């Protein structure tokens, strides 16, 4: 129910964050 | 170089996006030369509203507020994919998931960019870069947005909209006075429709692009699946073409996203920007109607010789208040024109570079595979 | 490996109105002494390939031979070529049909038994003498066609067996699975084609709006740059569409042919089972004959006895024939599966290279298009 995505600039990378 | 602002990351939490606003500065008004704060889309809307409501900035081109982040399309597709996980192969599911993550990331990058561009415009402006509410939203006392617990204030604001919306709707039926605000008006009027039409056509084109990209992944899956049972001679050949379509899918989805960012988003921006310029003309001419209303009041006041000075003064301020708005209006419309030419030029250049990047990437991909088979 | 190559070229519309048809130039090159010339060419209409398949199937399919099927009757493509609308979709249809007729004929001439058939090699030599609007032929061929159809459906619905030995059924499993994987990849490419086409349309729309934007522009430099960008988009939308046709005729249609050939090995296995059944039925008939004699051995009629002893001798021979056909048909499916595999490795690589070169040409075109617009973007002052 609480899927969140992190978008970061180091070039950009997107990370899935899974927290039930 | 004295006030540099970037948005290095953001986090999409449920129905909200949080932006990490990073600031580098040499200005002694800030406590640190480098710092970062978290900000939500509503904080940018508040900053924009406060800058518009500041009377001393009435003659400045306030940058348009960034658009609300819209993830409903990408999120709905991602949910439907999860409900369908049992109806497709693990390879098809993984591919479709990757294409939707790329669509989500394209919308996310366009959103971050639009919010960064808004702050960079404020920092680049010789007056607005010194604004207290701007400095407070950057390197001030943390965040002062939703610090007040009571919603009573929110209820009062919502009511104004039901009453406020009617004034704008009624104002549409009006006739231009004098000789000002003539040809240009119908132009904006005309350009908005051309801008809106090119926006929906752009959106349809990119969404068709992603559809094509999706096929590439689905095709590579059936190719891979097909190559399993088969004589070994052709079995390896088929895996090389499935490997190819797996990569080609990645570039097609990438060209759709960059297309959404450079063209569709550029057109979205100036569709709302035109709307803002139209509100300027509406207010300028409003003064005009006010100046007529005032004269009709002096004409009668002079006959009875009672409140002549009072109605004289009223006429004088709506005459010259019109000129004061008229000056700032023309100063901002011209400002808009100059910024629109720079924006179009910038996106067209960038888009062309990205289109060339992906085209060459596909050529090398297809080239190596073709030269591979020709030289078995 | 026969030193014989067939090519199909030059789709030509012959005649006018309702009697108009498309002929194809069938070119043959061979060193085989069964032909009068080492190189020759004939004109053949699509229905002549159907007539070849009919004659070959009547002679050979009942004996367990895998007779390659011709490409399907596209009614939609026939109407398009007849309505005279010289466009791009008619040329695509004719090229698709030509390519499929060429494969079909290549399969026929690569097969040892069919290459020796007088209708294949020797009918390649017969004046077409096309004529139009003759009802009498429709009246006799047509009456026979409707009655046969009713008989075919009842037999197909009433009885549906499987295989006996793994030779056809183990292998039959592999064949049926590979067809599943080909239809999967094929259905995914058809969506790729449409998607591409759908992309070409949206790019055409976008191209137009850009030109309209350039015209609305009040800045000469921006109108010039925008106008030029539209011309780039205009060229790209053609690449998209031509690529979509290559995705379909050079890839999607390639898969369909293999699915067409696999179904021809499936039909061979099915025909092997039909022969086995007929063989078994003959044995059941023979038992009834032997039992008919046993009953008469106790009777007192020597004439009816010899009657029974003869029908046994006759059906001893018949069951021997059906058994010898089953052996031969079993050899055909083996010969047919090997042919399908060897032809796959011989041609598959080149057909994939042909398609991949089609994507390589596109990208090369993309690069040149944008490399040429780059200097025009920088020239915006």
Residue numbers in the entry:
A (entry chain C): 171 to 180, 191 to 200
B (entry chain B): 29 to 404
C (entry chain A): 142 to 522
Original paper wording:
To understand how coat assembly, cargo sorting and membrane deformation are coordinated, we performed cryo-electron tomography (cryo-ET) on the tubulation reaction mediated by SNX1–SNX5 in the presence of CI-MPR2330–2491, and solved the three-dimensional (3D) structure by subtomogram averaging. Initial subtomogram averaging of short tube segments revealed right-handed helices around the membrane with a different number of helix starts (rows around the axis) depending on the tubes. Following the methodology described in Subtomogram averaging, we characterized the helical behavior of the coating of each filament to perform a particle extraction guided by the lattice geometry determined in each case, leading to two different averages: one average that included the structure of three complete consecutive particles (three-particle average, resolution ~12 Å), and a finer average that included the structure of individual particles (one-particle average, resolution ~10 Å). At this resolution, the PX and BAR domains were clearly resolved in the cryo-electron microscopy (cryo-EM) maps revealing a network of interactions that involve the edge of BAR domains (BARtip) and the PX domains, which we denoted as BARtip-to-BARtip and BARtip-to-PX interactions. The SNX1–SNX5 heterodimer forms helical rows that are held together mainly through two intertwined BARtip-to-PX contacts between the edge of one BAR domain and the PX domain of the next heterodimer. Thus, although we could not exclude orientations with contacts between identical protomers, we considered the head-to-tail interlinkage, which is the most plausible scaffold in the presence of cargo. The average peripheral membrane diameter was 28 ± 2 nm, which was decorated with a ~3.7-nm-thick protein coat. BARtip-to-BARtip contacts occur between the side-tips of the α2 helices from each BAR domain, resembling an SNX1 coat, whereas BARtip-to-PX contacts involve the tip of the α3 helix from each BAR domain with the start of the amphipathic helix (SAH) in the adjacent molecule.
